[PDB]
């Protein structure tokens, strides 16, 4: 009989598509030296031929396809003023509020790409034509509780457009295509959630509201923000988010530890 | 006359290969006014045809060269255990010792890739053939002097190599390569530096150093890390590196604020 902590180990091990029954007769010591090899053999592949990192090529896809629906790409900075917290309508008795990693005094890890988004919408719209439609992939950081879908680590997309077209059937046409084209099954649940059963992929909102005020901003508007790491974890059927995430324990899915 | 205020405002709308002399009689008022169309003009033309970040843009056209050299693409965490500095040889008495940006109490933002490249150079050992190949690019953070070759929030290459072929030819040939590649001019300093003219680009090591058992580390290796917007500051000619980060005030070093 397998321990706890023996197939805590094995489970580091397998890959989801593995077809290896743990609960076969065969001891630890060799089940775990058959998955040792077969993790090894994974990684030597990837070194051999392909070589691109899960996180940075789907980055990058993601990237390509925005731009081709032309979306400017955006990057702004992950430190940002503490002010932008506040400022987006979050003090006490918000979950975001307790959240945010601070740095030094006025500063802190962005939990969100909103505050940058809404000031490149303000500023752009004052030298480029209408619509405006940016987006932009990055860090952000969130003190979560442990689970196995949060990351305190993670990069977001956010796409925003500003100006005509922000109808709420245009919003659901670019998620819609966007992770087809991606080749992620959701539902759209309805602002409105993009999930998979359970797994928020999405949140996306339709503007204006209030809160634009606040920020500059005048007119209509439509946008999202998806995690990264959440996709890969459904696309390659992931039981924990850990296995996609920047990572020294895994290389796109693959422990690291052998 | 135009005073030190109007001067520098239109030095921020200014772009390196403007051919305009602000030193000409036609006032502020005026001089401002056909900048402010220029830049428009520039940020139309982006968002018409290419729409890619320079950063980003970059960072891509750095691991196309890498991976396509052989080296694997790794991200590793951002924000990493506060231990990584001290066992890095950073106290008291070295300057990057004091310009680490401390998230709560075991933590800080990476100010170097060593630490994790170190990690993944000695996981990755015990499954791939030698040599073993790794770069890294993403955010890195050190708090600085004002200075106009200094960013507090950057963008690090790292690469490194261990095993066989190890050596200082080596090492200056994938430094070369890449910079003609890129087209850098540059001249290597001989530990070694790449200087472009005063500009640090890079610092390049050739190991084994007795630092490396502390990491559990014991063949040779040879590697480097660049800063991205230095790069993309002796490119684009940027007068100051601000033009080339993450920003809210430049995109591809055209002002924000117009
Ligand atoms: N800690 C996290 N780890 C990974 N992805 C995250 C995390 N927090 C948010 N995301 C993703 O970022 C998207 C935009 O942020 P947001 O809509 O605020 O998420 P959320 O409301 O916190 N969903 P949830 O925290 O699961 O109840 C989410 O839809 C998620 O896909
Ligand atoms: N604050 C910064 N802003 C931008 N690039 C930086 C910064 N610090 C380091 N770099 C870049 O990262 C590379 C690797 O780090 P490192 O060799 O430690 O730089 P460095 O020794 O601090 N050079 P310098 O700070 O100018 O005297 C450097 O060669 C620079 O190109
Ligand atoms: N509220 C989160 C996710 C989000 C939701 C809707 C729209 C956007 C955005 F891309 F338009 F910013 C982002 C964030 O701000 O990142
Ligand atoms: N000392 C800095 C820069 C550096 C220098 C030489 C080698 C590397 C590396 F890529 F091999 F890590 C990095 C840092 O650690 O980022
Ligand atoms: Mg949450
Ligand atoms: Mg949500
Ligand atoms: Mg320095
Ligand atoms: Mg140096």
Redesign the interface.
Known sequence: ALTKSQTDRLEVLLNPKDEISLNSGKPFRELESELLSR??KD??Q??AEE???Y??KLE?EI?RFF?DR??????????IPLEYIERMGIDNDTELSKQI????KNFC?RPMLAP?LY??LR??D????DPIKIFEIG?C?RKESDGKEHL??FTMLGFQQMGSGCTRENLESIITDFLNHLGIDFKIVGTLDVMHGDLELSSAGVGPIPLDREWGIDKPWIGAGFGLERLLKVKHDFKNIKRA????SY?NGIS???
């Not at 032309?70 to 430190?79: A, D, R």
């Not at 990693?101 to 030094?104: E, M, P, Q, S």
């Open positions: 993790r090894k990684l030597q990837i070194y070589r691109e990192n996180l940075g990058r990237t731009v032309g979306f400017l790409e955006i990057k702004s900075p992950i430190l990693f601070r740095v030094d890890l940058n000031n490149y500023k752009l004052r030298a480029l034509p860090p950081y305190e680590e995430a920047r990572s020294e290389y690291t530890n052998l």
